[PDB]
């Protein structure tokens, strides 16, 4: 048993202690909730982005900087590694909490979801629930959350608001670029569970890479760019206790297994009438997967990096 | 003077404290010996594999994750760096202790060898012996060692069994794949000393990389795969106080300098009647070496990465 | 506000505590100044080189090992990342202090410059000055500094000599190779400010890579080699609050924008009558730049890695 909230706490404490170094701004709300601004008014940075990503993954993953170089496209990249794949990426990292309090809307991700159980079905499917007296949630938003947003999150997690920590950054920020690319492993795990209905607790180890998107000048375009890093630039290495249907599942895993594949996400979005429900959920996957079946010793691969679409997306 | 056992201890203590996070299982035997299971019953992982490798290298090296990408073969890789090349890789890392107690057999590597002096000739040749009241040994085995194996190791090291730590993983595990690939620098140093009879204390700094093998379904095949990562996928950068015979030595260093080069190790093994003695010891070397002569400023290179043999080995 | 001296101190303390592990030799002078030899008599190493580089950058950057592989040239490389670009690289890292006391000459770099203000113009231009009771300076020299050099540096920084720390390594050492390649980001920032007269406080985040030069057998050749790593092997990713002249500035940023571009620095130096003043200051820049305009979302690129000149430089 590992606690995603307890294992994320030391990283949060480090971010608070090193706030100036990280360009994050920390404030306490009147209910006692600590809000760590990582990109709304604060500048944040690469280091804030890496820690944000690790906090998001429940302290159960390492997220580090590396380089992406393919077909004359060179970018900074993240490298994500976890030995608790389902729990790190799905019990924590997945943005599965739509947080809406009054006039505030934001997608919430990170270990607090494992206390509030958002959504409940995920936790039943992977058989996980956290027991912790602290709650940590990451909010993707262009606005800092006020006291009643904090109160709501703290309440649903069953903790005192003094023991709630909220990390916040917009999509169009360097922390946005880093933290979204860091979910390259997660999107693979989520598609396995939700779309392909595979038992993701079979996935024992995981590591992956994805380029870091050039920061757009608004959150809408940044959503497209950061998604494209995964769909067209992401590679995931999975190590699985496999079965008979593993080879077929691997062929269905990459983003190219979708009919929506081929264009920058912004164009996929536009052609879907700006409606997420009209997009094939199977398109939200890594460009390239390499899967080692631990029970047979075999390796299955599917998908490719698509530098052309990345160049189109970033206007390069 | 650096102690390989004292410098490895903090890493062992970290592994014990973070056992759940690492998927390692720690138990104390009746004589007081601590056994850290990193892959027999415990799952282990990448992080357990990296720490296992660093413990093996006496706390005198950094072993980190990176990526291997050549000719359409992309795998996770290790990057190994040490500023104590002979001591880290030969006084500690080398699997030079055949541990056999009753019905238990295992190859032992790591800093405990520098107390027990296994084999004695290596320590005379590099002029090193550890002085420490703790002993740490890594065992490559499909079975966890019992009390009398621990007692034997503790006795030969001259320490109380309460101050002995045993790390264990099979070849066919992710920790197996990581820790074997991490000896890419070591195999170069060992061949220099043993095969080419070079003074390896001339080697001042070293760094190297090797792909991490897809985990096989048995230890025998895993031995071949993990060896191939070094022989056909390994690159070593050595910085040497050189002499007149340095250029000739470098040409003889890579695995291709052997007549056994060209096929996956499993096939080299089969053609040698499954007898290690009938294999040319010069084949146990990195695919590619780059050697900087610190006294002349010159650089000598030899060997190449062989992606074809790697693909054959992993059935890709 | 971040202090480059206070943030570098913990790294200095780590180097002193782990001196044996790092192959650095620490001594106290009679005025109380601590001198950390990282390559004159001490061997140093990769790890000493990485810490030296981070100390040099005021504890405001991460410098780690990675790999450089282009056109059949494979070398170790550094990866440099900072979220305080102007302060880390210009208030600290830049070798802007010509230290000359008696018969001792050395280029001084690192956070002590932010106390002594060397040169004063840089600190006025970026609006930065450190407030710290400790001073840390890195000296590139083939000789260890004696008491009166230490006294001079301590005096100009306004600190007691007991609170001064001097790190020393020659150009022709592995620490020399590492620490010079680590200024790949710095040379870009310096050219922006000094040559192109751009407001470098607009640069919000930065990351870059450069190969580590094979160590030459004298400091003169090592100067050429280590410079070539940046000029012909360096890539810098900058994230800027841009303006209207950003695209033109980016085209002027790489080393190829200079008429002196094309040959190893040793040959540029020889053709300039061994006079630094006859060399175009614009040639001291990264080979390749990738610049993300944070205000428009656009990315501008200029320059290329030149493996041919690197091979010529290292005689490969």
**Strand order from edge to edge, sheet including B97-101:** B25-28, B34-37, B164-169, B135-140, B104-109, B97-101
What are the CA-CA distances from residue A70 to residues A67, A178, A311, C198 (Å)? Answer: 10, 19, 11, 31
**Resolved by:** X-ray
- Which chain B residues are Cβ-neighbours of A235 within 8 angstroms? 74
Same domain for C153 and C57, yes or no, is no
What are the CA-CA distances from residue B48 to residues A70, A83, A205, B55, B139 (Å)? Answer: 31, 9, 11, 10, 14
Contacts for C41 with CB less than 8 Å, ≥ 6 apart: C25, C144
Min Cα distance C309 → chain B (Å) is: 15
Rounded Cα gap, residues A32 and A178, in angstroms: 29
Task: Name the nearest CA neighbour of A299 among B316, B224, B74.
Answer: B316
Rounded Cα gap, residues B163 and B85, in angstroms: 26
- Boundary (domain end) residue, out of A151, A169, A187: A169
Same domain for A54 and A165, yes or no, is no
Q: What sign has the CA pseudo-torsion C135, C139, C144, C145?
A: negative
Tokens coding C55: 């100390």
Nearest CB to A83: which of B45, B66, B215? B45
Best of A2, A239, A287, A291 to substitute, by most chain B Cβ atoms within 10 angstroms, is A239
Q: What is the DSSP string of chain B?
A: ---HHHHHHHHHHHHHHTHHHHT-EEEE-TTS-EEEESSSSS---HHHHHHHHHHHTTT-EEEEEEEEEETTEEEEEEEEEESSHHIIIIIIIS--EEEEETTEEEEEESTTHHHHTSSHHHHHHHT-----S-EEEEEE-SS---HHHHHHHHHHHTS-GGGEEEEEE-SSSHHHHHHHHTTHHHHHHHIIIIIS---GGGEEEEEEEEEPPPPPSSHHHHHHHHHHHHHHH-EEEEEE---TTHHHHHHHSSGGGSTTTTS-HHHHHHHTTT-GGGS-GGGSS-SEEEEEETTT--EEEEE---HHHHHHHTT-
CB C148 within 8 A of CB C33: no
8 Å CB contact of B297 and C215: yes
Same domain for B37 and B106, yes or no, is yes
Rounded Cα gap, residues A245 and A54, in angstroms: 32
What are the CA-CA distances from residue C292 to residues A209, B193, C153, C230 (Å)? Answer: 21, 50, 39, 20
CB C89 within 8 A of CB C57: yes
8 Å CB contact of C314 and B299: yes
Contacts for B316 with CB less than 8 Å, ≥ 6 apart: A299, A301, B73, B310
The domain of A29 spans: 1-44+96-169
Diameter over CA atoms, chain B: 56
Residue B25 forms beta bridges with which residues?
A: B37
Rg of chain C over all Cα atoms, to the nearest angstrom: 18
Same domain for B269 and B186, yes or no, is yes
8 Å CB contact of A205 and B46: yes
Min Cα distance A217 → chain C (Å) is: 5
Rounded Cα gap, residues B17 and A269, in angstroms: 47
Same domain for A206 and A295, yes or no, is yes
Is B227 within 8 Å of chain C by CB? no
- Boundary (domain end) residue, out of A140, A169, A198: A169
Rounded Cα gap, residues A83 and A94, in angstroms: 16
8 Å CB contact of A205 and B67: no
Same domain for B304 and B185, yes or no, is yes
Tokens coding B137: 């040994």
Same domain for A162 and A256, yes or no, is no
CB B132 within 8 A of CB B3: yes
**Strand order from edge to edge, sheet including C104-109:** C25-28, C34-37, C164-169, C135-140, C104-109, C97-101
What is the domain count for chain B? 2
Q: What is the CATH number of the domain that holds C120?
A: 3.10.340.11
Is A149 within 8 Å of chain C by CB? no
Same domain for A159 and A79, yes or no, is no
Same domain for C72 and C206, yes or no, is yes
Resolution for this experimental structure (Å): 2.0
- Boundary (domain end) residue, out of A169, A196, A217: A169
Task: Name the nearest CA neighbour of B96 among B216, B189, B199, B200.
Answer: B189
Count Cα atoms within 13 angstroms, Cβ side, for A42: 26
Min Cα distance C133 → chain B (Å) is: 32
Is C271 within 8 Å of chain B by CB? no
| Residue A239: DSSP 8-state | E
Alpha helices in chain A (DSSP H): 4-17, 19-22, 46-56, 85-86, 113-116, 120-126, 147-157, 174-181, 184-190, 219-233, 246-252, 265-271, 307-313
Same domain for A137 and A227, yes or no, is no
Min Cα distance B182 → chain C (Å) is: 15
Same domain for C73 and C180, yes or no, is yes
Rounded Cα gap, residues A152 and A164, in angstroms: 11
Rounded Cα gap, residues B153 and B136, in angstroms: 9
Best of B73, B171, B181, B214 to substitute, by most chain A Cβ atoms within 10 angstroms, is B214
Q: What is the CATH number of the domain that holds C189?
A: 3.30.1030.10
Task: Give the number of other CB atoms < 10 A from CB of residue A270.
Answer: 12
Tokens coding B49: 């594999």
Contacts for A82 with CB less than 8 Å, ≥ 6 apart: A57, A60, A61, A62, A88, A89, A185, A205, A206, A207
Rounded Cα gap, residues B213 and B265, in angstroms: 13
Q: Are strands C235-240 and C135-140 parallel, antiparallel or unpaired?
A: unpaired
Nearest CB to A20: which of C1, C235, C297? C1
Rg of chain B over all Cα atoms, to the nearest angstrom: 18
8 Å CB contact of B46 and A81: yes
Task: Give the number of other CB atoms < 10 A from CB of residue B124.
Answer: 11
Neighbours of chain C (3+ CB pairs under 8 A): A, B
Tell me how many degrees the CA angle B221-B227-B231 measures, rounded to the nearest 5: 140
CB A192 within 8 A of CB A203: yes
Contacts for A157 with CB less than 8 Å, ≥ 6 apart: A112, A115, A116, A135, A137, A164
Same domain for A135 and A267, yes or no, is no
Rounded Cα gap, residues A236 and A245, in angstroms: 19
Best of C39, C51, C74 to substitute, by most chain B Cβ atoms within 10 angstroms, is C74
Nearest CA in chain B to C77: B207
Phi, psi of B23 (to 5 degrees): 60, 35
Rounded Cα gap, residues A148 and A134, in angstroms: 18
Task: Name the nearest CA neighbour of C139 among C170, C184, C103, C117.
Answer: C170
Q: Give contacts of A 56-95 with C, CB under 8 A.
A: 65-67, 74-76
Report the number of secondary-structure helices (H) and strands (E) in chain A: 13, 12
What 3-state DSSP class applies to A68? Answer: strand
């Amino acid at each position: 048993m590992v606690s995603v909230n307890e294992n994320a706490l030391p990283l949060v404490e480090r971010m608070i202690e090193r706030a100036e170094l990280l360009n994050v701004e920390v404030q306490e709300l009147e209910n006692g909730t600590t809000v760590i601004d990582c990109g709304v008014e604060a500048a944040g940075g690469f280091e804030a982005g890496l820690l944000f990503s690790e906090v998001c993954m429940g302290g159960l993953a390492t997220v580090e900087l590396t380089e992406f170089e393919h077909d004359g496209l060179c970018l900074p990249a993240v490298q994500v590694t976890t030995d608790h794949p389902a729990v790190s990426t799905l019990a924590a990292q997945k943005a599965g909490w739509q947080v809406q309090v009054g006039d505030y809307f934001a997608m919430g991700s990170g270990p607090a979801r494992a206390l509030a159980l958002k959504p409940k079905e995920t936790y039943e499917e992977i058989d996980y629930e956290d027991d912790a007296d602290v709650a940590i949630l990451c909010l993707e938003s262009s606005e800092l959350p006020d006291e009643d947003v904090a109160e709501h999150v703290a309440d649903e997690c069953g903790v005192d608001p003094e023991n709630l920590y909220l990390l916040v950054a917009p999509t169009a920020s360097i922390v946005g670029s880093v933290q979204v690319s860091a979910r390259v492993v997660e999107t693979g795990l989520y598609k396995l569970l939700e779309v392909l209905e595979y038992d993701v607790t079979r996935v024992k180890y995981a590591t992956g890479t994805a380029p870091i998107a050039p920061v757009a000048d608004d959150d809408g375009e940044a959503m497209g760019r950061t998604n494209d890093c995964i769909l067209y630039g992401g590679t995931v290495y999975l190590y699985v206790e496999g079965d008979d249907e593993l080879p077929e599942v691997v062929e269905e895993l990459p983003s190219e297994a979708s009919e929506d594949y081929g264009k920058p996400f912004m164009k996929i979005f536009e052609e879907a009438d700006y409606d997420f429900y009209k997009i094939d959920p199977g398109v939200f996957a890594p460009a390239r997967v390499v899967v080692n079946d631990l029970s047979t010793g075999k390796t299955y691969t599917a998908g490719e990096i698509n530098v052309d679409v990345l160049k189109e997306s970033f206007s390069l």
